[PDB]
């Protein structure tokens, strides 16, 4: 086919690999920041549920 086909294919391959490397580094930094301070969707450790707290009036008023 000629040298231009291999040239442009190499450029496309390099762009794909560079974007993948950038995204991998971004993923590492995002995971580290989330686990350091959990504020995104990931590393959300559980907590006792609100929906099983009895809010009805008790036998004792001081509750």
């Amino acid at each position: 086919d000629g040298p231009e086909k291999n040239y442009e294919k190499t450029l496309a391959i390099l762009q794909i690999e560079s974007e993948k490397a950038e995204l991998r580094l971004k993923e590492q930094e995002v995971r580290r920041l989330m686990r350091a301070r959990g504020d995104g969707p990931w590393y959300q450790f559980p907590t006792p549920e609100k929906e099983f707290i009895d809010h009805s009036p008790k036998a004792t008023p001081d509750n």
């Binding site: 040239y7 190499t10 450029l11 390099l14 762009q15």
Partner: protein, 170 residues
């Protein structure tokens, strides 16, 4: 003769005329005349037939000049596209400089063989051109490794320019 005297210089031959002061015949002249009549004429006829066939089926091929892509100096680091294009054009220029060096070496060898016993005197300009091109090649491509690159060549040039600038201070 695809080659031209502009890139492959050759001084004009100055052969002396014969002065046959002896009466003996010259076996060299007799053998050259017979060699022409026996060997050179049929070979010339065969080559002329071949060239006639080529002129019948004549075709052409071209050179493929490349244009200058942006170099390694004028685009940001980590950009693999610009680095790839600069690396490819630097490897292209490296191969071209290799063949420039080969041309100069061929010219030097031709000068030495042509002049023979007078090579120490009249090959002054060929030796001077060889020395200058050798110095430039050593300045640009010598200490680079087996992984020689545009980045390594740029680093070597920047170090050399820094040393020259520091020497120019005093």
């Amino acid at each position: 003769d695809s080659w031209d005297k502009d890139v492959y210089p050759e001084p004009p031959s100055r052969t002396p005329a014969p002065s046959p002061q002896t009466s003996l015949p010259n076996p060299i002249t007799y053998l050259t005349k017979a060699y022409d009549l026996v060997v050179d004429w049929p070979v010339t006829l065969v080559r002329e037939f071949i060239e006639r066939q080529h002129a019948k089926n004549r075709t052409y091929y071209y050179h493929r000049q490349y244009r200058r892509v942006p170099d390694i100096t004028e685009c940001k680091e980590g950009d693999v596209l610009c680095i790839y294009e600069a690396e490819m054009q630097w490897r292209r220029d490296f191969k071209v400089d290799q063949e420039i060096m080969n041309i100069i070496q061929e010219r030097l060898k031709a000068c030495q063989q042509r002049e023979g016993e007078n090579y120490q005197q009249n090959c002054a300009k060929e030796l001077e051109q060889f020395t200058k091109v050798t110095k430039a090649y050593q300045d640009r491509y010598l200490d680079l490794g087996a992984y020689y690159s545009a980045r390594k060549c740029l680093a070597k040039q920047k170090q050399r320019m820094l040393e020259e600038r520091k020497a120019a201070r005093q």
